[PDB]
Subunit: 336 residues, 4 copies
């Protein structure tokens, strides 16, 4: 059974733990967490969550170097520097890197220095880091990869259906805009930030900001290299986001044919990854959905027979986290 | 001097009054208001505004059938039925219809029955109603028109630059999505509404909803008939919205050429209607801007040489209201 | 087997139904709902809720005048005029008045004229209407009462622990302030309203407003007559509120003792009604709590040995609805 | 001609500068700003503000180490270590400590080591640091104080009217609760924090937290020593807060009399510091008010002739910053 370590017990770190906790017969086993905030803080923020609600499990605090969840305990380490982490001592097989600071080979490699065997970054990698999106190119994964990236939340929402669109209609070019819930990277009130837009009060504005999803899609789907670009619009919601993709395709089509193409994948190769919703819902209704992307069938439009517009919802926190568990499961099941 | 009457003292009704108050040497003269809420309520909500801030003017309450603003008084009527209104008695020349309920010829025509000479609907008209967008087709207006529409806020933001795009590059087809601030039509908490999405808590969700701007553009710009479609995404902000337009054009171009095309119009035929912003701002920064549309130059993108994506900001309340005053001014200056 | 009818399928009406649905061996049978919005709306808003999340039950429309919940079919009617409802024809024993418009005898009386045998107003009754707060004075209820009131959510949170305070320390005089979540009665954006403060944008302000909870407590707790007063502060949160009580007691005490008095009562006389939380929690953590009041023990203070300050949380929608169910249960248990 | 340096260009630092900029014949000369974010950021965030709106002044960068405001050039430096600041070299007379990190003697002392002649902490000082509240005890300030504190926004709103209450009615004991807007110290989304409640999503909860304002009032008002206590409730509003005071007074009185006492003081001893509003207003209406406290007269209540409840509003950012300017003005006026 794969011994897992969670580096950075934040939104994704905690969502990951709770997603894993819900899996039946998991090949993973979370033995340690690195929360630079304290054992008591880890147990408290794990039990009480403003987004997921109160954790339906017995969350207690063990000694002062570990917490308890439904009985099974998990040690709690604390060190802003990976090289010191007791990964080697504990024999950590995989480190879930969710700090948002160690994304390049050197930064993430430190976990390896500490004694870890593998590292899975819960974000896009930097400079030669194999990226994988479950349902798109996960089959290209090999146990030889010591450092891997699960891409971004937007990329995991877009890639699945872009793959279907390209395969069935052939994308020529396109553009995307994601109306995204605010995240920890933004500021509560106008404050310093390298990105002068993200520096503005998050709950008060619609804030345009760059996104890497467009180019990231090209990584997991080589055929899209240089065909897409896009932006993000952060808005006053705490979780759940939506992507608006517009593409010109080679084969003429219409809205209902596109929707059917999505349903076919949803019922087959993309079951559990892509879903198609025919009800008139809103963002709050997609909270805690396990899929990576949900097409709002009713909003699909086709202009001039070859300009397709698709609207897809995604729980950037929970949905993405389920994909982290899936990739971790792959790393385990394909362990040699 | 044109005698004006404001029917429905709501967001637009009040914004209109304050916009007019700020104009220098106005050809209009607001003599009466129809607030089914009371003289005291009119004066209070006119003086104190959660969006515009406290009205910098002496707002008092006269008798009980009129209010006072910086000295000049304005009578206050109250009747949910236009046919009864004392328009004839007062000799009302133009009625600013901002109730949101009298948009067809029959409904708005009642103001005419009451004795009003003209009616200007602060919203899209229904069934054979001449619609005008200042800076696009206002020249087609004639004093013979007894009932006219100033279209919607989104239409006033989109039309101006779509006109420039079509004239300079030739639009083949396109799609639009407006991330719009919530409005009075939505619900504070999940409650009844014909639109099951707009029925959901407005400050808590991203709510997809239909928009008529796409087809409305075709009204003021015949050449666009059947070339555009789009949707709206209402989000948790009280005012200021943004439109994301994607179009395939006939002439190949690039981002900087498109921006320059917009600047040229902004400095000329569209001065005061269209503006181009080169700073990294957010929605809050566009509050109280007088223009109908402001291009976020830095976000303009061109894919595959002919797929143009443009992001434009607009103060749906204040910006639109300034356009209502402009159209009213036209009705006055062109009065025969 | 009380035949129950729900008049007004709003926040409380829907919370009521879901609360009732979760009870085991209920003496109530909800057979009809009067939803002026129609069958599709009732089914949709019952299934999807921005606060409660998606109803974990099979909810769907049944024909054109009913809906089903896990196979249980419930008739749906639509009439704003209570006198025309088919209560007598259907043999309705109890009507749950959750409209907020028929809170007086002449109004609620309309249901009796329509044939209903009794009415329970989900709010303070207006005039000489018997009001009951479960855990405080319900034993005073009599089958002879044809129209009763369950009081407000605020009164239901306050009364319970004030009963404990008065019984063990003796309240001489006091004042309270409730920091209440916004409700449908408030305005989304500055709009007409009897209360010039409730007329202001709800998600943007701290809105002071009157409250009758202080006086209402004297109806269920005769001893407190003329001893308490209070006001309310509506803040930008969708659900869950909190009461701040300051009372001068006859018996000198201290914080630890006061909390002790609350715990013993919560473990006996007020079990299931009053609770005491020793955790450093926030509003969202109290969502969907079945009790009527939860004392935040760490906030209890006592100044000069006799001035006590108590802070208690309460889910104004769900917690109160559980109480409506309980009061309805009492009506059934004492039915003659 | 006091040479002033602003350390920490945050909400208060920027509000300070804008407040100072609006004063006529100021004895202060802001010559330098230490903004760890850099020159472009300082210029940008000073010009664009989500709360104050766009600064009506020509703001722009000047070279690579300064900015200008209407032609007035201000040097900008960037160092997180106060000891390395060029205070002595520049001849800085007074440092405005708005970082929130150097509030103790050893910390603020670092500025003195760097050559500054005096430090004014924009917050409660930690330890034996003289604290002053303009309108309450400023006359006690002496040029000999090298490090002083202007107290918190809450203490500045409370002290003024509590001085009036104590002087005309005699306060025996009391308790207060402040419904405060969120601040940068809180978390955007559930994240690490010393205070497990402040760690919770700020725009989503009512967050209780400790306050030292009650005790701080005793520092500027010796008479109230050990007579008051209190707590704070952080709510989802960006700016403007309100204090709820409940005191037991020695002199029996009534609401109208208490308000009368406040008005006479606001017209004399506390003019420009304390104000009384007789309008039914909401938080947003008190934005950018220069006074430190505004009593909401219609909310004043008196229970049992001696229990008084007072509610006062205060712009925690702007109102308090005007006070920092005034205290700075005093430092200049008493300079030796
Ligand atoms: N939130 C979401 O929906 C998505 C986020 N992501 C990405 O995942 C990453 C994390 O996001 P999110 O979970 O929202 O953020 P969080 O702030 O919740 O989590 C980051 C965690 O890392 C900790 N940390 C920071 N520095 C270090 C360090 N040097 N060493 C060890 N631990 C450290 C932080 O502690 P502390 O705050 O105290 O410094 C925090 O606990 C980011 O790259 C984000 O872009 C990807 C998909 C979705
Ligand atoms: N808000 C904005 O940014 C934009 C809105 N518009 C459009 O303008 C219209 C008004 O919008 P908005 O100003 O936001 O809404 P408001 O609710 O602020 O204004 C509508 C006003 O009409 C009054 N009213 C309702 N029915 C009647 C009636 N039967 N007779 C007389 N008066 C009546 C309302 O009173 P009461 O509420 O008490 O019934 C209210 O005062 C809508 O069509 C909207 O789509 C167009 C562009 C922009
Ligand atoms: N909100 C809460 O936390 C609590 C509220 N209550 C009480 O319950 C009542 C409802 O409150 P709340 O649910 O918050 O308010 P809402 O405004 O959300 O609900 C009122 C409902 O009544 C419907 N309605 C209006 N008129 C009629 C009518 N004539 N006949 C039948 N149905 C009608 C409304 O439909 P439509 O909007 O389409 O007109 C709406 O669905 C009030 O008495 C309130 O004091 C009690 C405890 C708690
Ligand atoms: N907010 C309000 O209403 C009031 C606050 N105050 C007090 O003023 C202070 C600041 O509060 P507030 O503005 O709200 O907080 P913010 O967090 O908004 O501002 C703090 C600022 O200090 C900067 N900073 C951090 N460390 C240093 C350093 N070592 N040297 C120089 N600058 C630094 C920060 O930059 P960075 O974030 O990049 O690290 C940030 O710009 C606190 O003492 C607070 O109690 C007083 C009255 C009112």
């Amino acid at each position: 059974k794969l011994k897992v370590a969670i580096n950075g017990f934040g939104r994704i770190g905690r969502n990951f733990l709770r997603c894993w906790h819900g899996r039946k017969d998991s090949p993973l086993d979370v033995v340690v967490i690195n929360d630079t905030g304290g054992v008591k803080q880890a147990s408290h923020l794990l039990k009480y969550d403003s987004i997921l609600g109160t954790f339906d499990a017995d969350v207690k605090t063990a000694g002062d170097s570990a917490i308890s969840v439904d009985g099974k305990v998990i040690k709690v380490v604390s060190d802003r520097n990976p090289v010191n982490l007791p990964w080697g001592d504990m024999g950590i097989d995989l480190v879930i890197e969710g700090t948002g600071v160690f994304v390049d080979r050197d930064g993430a490699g430190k976990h390896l220095q500490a004694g870890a065997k593998k590292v899975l970054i819960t974000a896009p990698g930097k400079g030669d880091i194999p990226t994988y999106v479950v349902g798109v190119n996960e089959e290209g994964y090999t146990h030889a990869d010591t450092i891997i990236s699960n891409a971004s939340c937007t990329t995991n929402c877009l890639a699945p259906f872009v793959k279907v669109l390209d395969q069935k209609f052939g994308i020529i070019k396109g553009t995307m805009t994601t109306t995204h819930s605010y995240t920890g990277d933004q500021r509560l009130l106008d404050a310093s930030h390298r990105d002068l837009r993200r520096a503005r009060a998050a709950c008060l504005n619609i804030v345009p900001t760059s996104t890497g999803a467009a180019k990231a899609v090209a990584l997991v789907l080589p055929n899209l290299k240089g065909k897409l670009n896009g932006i993000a619009l952060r808005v006053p919601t705490p979780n759940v986001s939506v992507v608006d993709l517009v593409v010109q395709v080679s084969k003429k089509t219409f809205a209902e044919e596109v929707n059917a193409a999505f349903r076919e994948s949803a019922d087959n190769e993309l079951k559990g990854i892509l879903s198609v919703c025919d009800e008139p819902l809103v963002s709050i209704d997609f909270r805690c959905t396990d899929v990576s992307s949900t097409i709002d069938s009713s909003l699909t439009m086709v202009m001039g027979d070859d300009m397709v517009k698709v609207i897809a919802w995604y729980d950037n926190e929970w949905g993405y986290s389920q994909r982290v568990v899936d990739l971790a499961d792959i790393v385990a099941n394909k362990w040699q």
